[PDB]
Design a binder for this molecule. Structure first.
Ligand SMILES: CN1/C(=C/C=C/c2cc[n+](CCCS(=O)(=O)O)c3ccccc23)C(C)(C)c2ccccc21
Lengths: 111, 109
């Protein structure tokens, strides 16, 4: 099982602001840099957020990240159809001494 | 076992320029971004290199990374007892559809 907890699936319509969550513990999320990535089926992930809240140049400005204690979050401010994908969080874990991951949150853009 | 190949260890003495190697395949190292991190004992890892050869701000120009074909390397110019950590490469792998890692190169000064 993934050591970090993400809700498996979220829906929304274009334009809606949706935030997804990544819950960990004192020995991971709380403690350590959190990274988020976006994965479409069959292709290489795109890093959306590194070091908790930093957005690479080239990632659309509607994506932002932050960390509140044992919980990290990724906000998508104005969902687009092209945002339908699987979103993962990860960080180092002090107690397992290696990388830990959420199980991914699949975002569906409806209408 | 780690999918990328690294020397399990590499001893050295202050002053000299060491090089850590990381070999993989066309579906990982060649076709994907390589990252390097450094892990001191009981300390959170620091990324020294992203996208093959770029340094995060706050990382001494004295680490450099690069790659050719299916292998990557991190050159540590001008050692220090401070640089005594375990150094790791990683990248996405298209064939496994997942992340792959080197086994780490424990540097000794
Ligand atoms: C540790 N780690 C990872 C780190 C990724 C780090 C960074 C990814 C992208 N940028 C680019 C932003 C600058 S720019 O490109 O906008 O100029 C960075 C910049 C500075 C430091 C780190 C990064 C990934 C790869 C997430 C990963 C995956 C699996 C396990 C571990 C693991």
């Amino acid at each position: 099982q993934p050591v970090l907890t993400q809700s498996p699936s979220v829906s929304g319509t274009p334009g809606q602001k949706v935030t997804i969550f990544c819950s960990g513990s004192s020995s991971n999320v709380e403690d350590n840099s959190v990274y988020w990535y976006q994965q479409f089926p069959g292709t290489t992930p795109k890093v959306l957020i590194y070091n908790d809240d930093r957005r690479p140049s080239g990632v659309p400005d509607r994506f932002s990240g932050s960390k509140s204690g044992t919980s990290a979050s990724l906000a998508i401010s104005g969902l687009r159809s092209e945002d339908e994908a699987d979103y993962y969080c990860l960080s180092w874990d002090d107690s397992l001494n290696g990388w830990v991951f959420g199980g991914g949150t699949k975002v569906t853009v409806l209408d």
